[PDB]
């Protein structure tokens, strides 16, 4: 579970600097 | 439905996107310049599109009209006819067989493969991947590139602690005057090296470090950037030029150190005012054999840790990213494994 925690805290970080990065996620109407 | 399998089949095979009454189940915008943003309507879609698979699938589909409406608009085609690959779309005939059997999930993976190979091998072809990636290791990541940005540094090392020491006032004219001297100096091929845009940040970085993560903090306020051009910008985003530009940051203020260091020892080892002792000094061994033995220590600890650093996660990075080209599948797949470790050297 050690690489599974790790491997989560990486997507944690890529999650936060996606956020920071402008937000490519939208919806319109 | 006859129209509607029509229109999937010209969108899933050359990208065109004409709805007229709204019914596709996608359209984008311009009908952030180069770059469109395509909306799906999920009030006409012909599934769910709740599940994983149902996602992947949608999102499949539109990736495949994506790449095909960009190789349209690059090759400055009309359309895209079915002799400049080996694989061959039929058309839609009866919309209940399509819903109820496999061929429909057959026929999007053999035109997304399509895609796929088409656009990996215009991008291999005539854009040069392997140079663009060459290119921005040398600049960002100095992959066997320090020759230049030593040289770089050791030219403006006055100009850079002045503006590190001074406020926002002071004028960084030279610097750019300097900057743009090497760069047209530099060959005009390097696409990379000739658009390299220079620029100040009011913040430093460890200030953006810990703007940007869940740590705590007028130096070093200098950083490059690329502007991305189309259709590469589809496949370059901006979270990976913010990614380079922190590691040039941070290579520079380690170079930038190191440069600092060698430069100490230089003095220490050429003046003759150092080098020299007698008189009954009874200081020198108290004195310079203290601060070389201290020089000696950060060299041994910053010299050591740079090493580390650039054999175990640059090199391997870059041998990684060397590798993973070698016949490639998918563009977007080369762009995630380059962000996955690019997310590694971060949180290493």
């Not at chain 2, 879609?45 to 949608?58: F, I, P, V, W």
Request: overall charge neutral; hydrophobic content about 35%.
């Amino acid at each position: 579970q050690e690489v599974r925690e790790h491997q989560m805290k990486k997507e944690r970080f890529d999650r936060a600097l996606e956020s920071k990065l402008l937000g490519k996620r939208h919806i319109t109407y | 439905s006859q129209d509607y399998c029509t229109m999937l089949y010209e969108w899933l095979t050359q990208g065109i996107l004409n709805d007229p009454y709204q019914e596709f189940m996608t359209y984008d915008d311009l009908e952030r310049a180069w770059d469109t943003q395509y909306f799906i309507r999920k009030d006409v879609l012909l599934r769910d599109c709740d599940s994983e698979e149902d996602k992947n699938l949608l999102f499949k589909m539109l990736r495949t009209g994506i790449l095909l409406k960009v190789v349209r608009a690059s090759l400055q085609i009309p359309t895209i006819p079915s002799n400049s690959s080996d694989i061959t779309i039929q058309e839609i005939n009866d919309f209940a067989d399509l819903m109820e059997g496999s061929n429909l999930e057959l026929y999007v993976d053999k035109c997304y493969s399509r895609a796929n190979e088409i656009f990996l091998k215009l991008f291999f072809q005539g854009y040069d991947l392997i140079n663009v990636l060459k290119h921005l290791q040398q600049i960002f990541l100095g992959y066997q590139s320090g020759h230049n940005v030593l040289k770089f540094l050791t030219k403006n090392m006055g100009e850079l602690t002045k503006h590190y020491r001074n406020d926002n006032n002071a004028n960084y004219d030279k610097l750019l005057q300097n900057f743009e001297l090497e760069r047209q100096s530099e060959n005009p091929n390097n696409l990379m090296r000739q658009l390299l845009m220079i620029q100040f940040d009011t913040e430093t970085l460890p200030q953006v470090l810990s703007h940007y993560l869940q740590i705590y903090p007028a130096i070093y306020h200098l950083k490059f950037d690329i502007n991305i051009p189309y259709p590469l910008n589809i496949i370059i985003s901006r979270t990976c030029m913010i990614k380079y530009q922190i590691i040039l940051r941070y290579q520079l203020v380690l170079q930038y150190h190191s440069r600092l260091l060698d430069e100490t020892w230089m003095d220490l080892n050429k003046t003759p005012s150092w080098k020299y002792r007698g008189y009954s000094h009874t200081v020198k061994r108290r004195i310079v054999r203290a601060t070389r033995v201290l020089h000696a220590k950060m060299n041994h600890f910053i010299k050591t840790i740079m090493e580390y650093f650039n054999q175990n996660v640059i090199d391997k990075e870059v041998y990684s990213l060397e590798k993973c080209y070698r016949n490639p599948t998918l563009a977007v797949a080369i762009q995630n494994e380059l962000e996955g470790g690019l997310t590694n050297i971060m949180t290493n």
